[PDB]
């Protein structure tokens, strides 16, 4: 349950939280071994995992159409921004090792800063798909959102943008 | 007897070997998930014919995967049946329900 | 036994938490002295008397400086 979740929060859905592309991380199974209202909680939490599953698929395919070394620079920084979310999945299991009384609310509380970083990058990846932008103008729509309005997304898109500029420093060494 | 017990204890010989083993690990859902979900299924009337599976423990699966990574060929689980390593389906643990 | 030593492991865990609570509020106590303080509170006695005897004994060890 606290291993099934910690893999449903990872990229392996299982019998509880089934994965579909028309609706991700579905729950409809009645649980007389839990409380009735807990499902409501769980629904909210599902949105955190879904994006993380979504984010991986994008990194998989993009590593004419949508191609280039630019497409190997956005995905590369998107790994680094998810890195404190991978570490934060190990931390939960380490806490579960000792305590038997830990509940869902602590997991919700702990991963609070990731409900603001993840959705505002989801719009960026959908914009990069819907528009056929594949050259240097990928950096533009990052640069508009890097100004930011919420503190998580101000630093993580910065992480990605620096890598883009560093790959440009190879082309603009060979040229100059 | 006293040698066979020493075997059975210190080395495993219970999931590649026909002996139905148990390990009550202080049950109660957080690591009891497979049994809980199965009880729920029986109460909801599947209707019955329950699956008999091997009940392998956890560390053993980890060791098996790491062996597969080494390059050992023809294993007890992940045996090839078409030239593609095909995982065994008669597995059950005290959690995840094998899905 | 084995389960008895398991209980003796669990009570050492609780006692480590009792050390943690002592240091987050900044006391002069350490674990060796706390090991006495716990038995005193096990036997039952007014803890204001024990705080008073500790706050006299700490001012009787500043005469060694």
């Amino acid at each position: 349950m606290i291993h099934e979740l910690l893999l449903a929060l990872s990229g392996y859905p299982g019998s509880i939280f089934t994965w579909n592309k028309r609706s991700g991380l579905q729950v409809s199974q009645d649980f007389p071994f839990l409380h009735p209202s807990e499902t409501s909680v769980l629904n909210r939490l599902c949105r955190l995992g879904t994006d993380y599953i979504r984010f991986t698929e994008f990194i998989e395919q993009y590593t004419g159409g949508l191609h280039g070394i630019y497409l190997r620079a956005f995905c590369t920084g998107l790994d680094s921004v998810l890195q404190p979310y991978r570490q934060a999945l190990l931390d939960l299991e380490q806490e579960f090792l000792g305590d038997p009384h830990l509940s869902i609310s602590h997991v919700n509380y702990f991963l609070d800063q990731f409900q603001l970083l993840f959705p505002s990058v989801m719009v960026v990846v959908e914009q990069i798909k819907s528009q056929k932008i594949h050259g240097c103008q990928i950096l533009e729509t990052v640069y508009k959102h890097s100004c930011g309005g919420l503190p998580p997304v101000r630093s993580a898109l910065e992480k990605i943008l620096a890598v883009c500029h560093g790959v440009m420093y190879k082309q603009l060494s060979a040229w100059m | 007897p006293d040698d066979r017990s020493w075997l059975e204890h210190h080395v495993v010989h219970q999931y590649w070997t026909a002996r139905p083993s148990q390990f009550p690990h202080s049950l109660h859902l957080h690591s009891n998930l497979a049994a809980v979900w199965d009880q729920h299924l029986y109460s909801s009337d599947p209707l019955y014919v329950p699956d008999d599976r091997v009940l392998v423990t956890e560390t053993q699966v980890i060791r098996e995967t790491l062996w597969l990574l080494s390059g050992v060929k023809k294993l007890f689980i992940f045996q090839l049946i078409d030239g593609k390593v095909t995982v065994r389906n008669n597995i059950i643990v005290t959690h995840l329900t094998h899905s | 036994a084995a389960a008895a030593a398991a209980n003796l492991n669990a009570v050492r865990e609780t006692m480590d938490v009792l050390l943690e609570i002592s240091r987050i509020l900044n006391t002069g106590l350490d674990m060796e002295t706390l090991s006495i303080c716990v038995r005193l509170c096990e036997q039952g006695i007014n803890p204001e008397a024990l705080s008073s005897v500790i706050k006299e004994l700490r001012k009787a060890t500043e005469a060694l400086k």
């Binding site: 038997p100 | 690591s31 | 003796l8 492991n9 006692m15």
Partner: peptide, 23 residues
């Protein structure tokens, strides 16, 4: 005797399946 004996350094290896007291 007892609390002095209690200060021993126990195991640091923990299980996953065992939740209630995994020594």
């Amino acid at each position: 005797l007892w609390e002095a004996a209690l200060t021993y350094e126990a195991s640091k290896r923990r299980c996953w399946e065992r939740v209630g007291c995994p020594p």
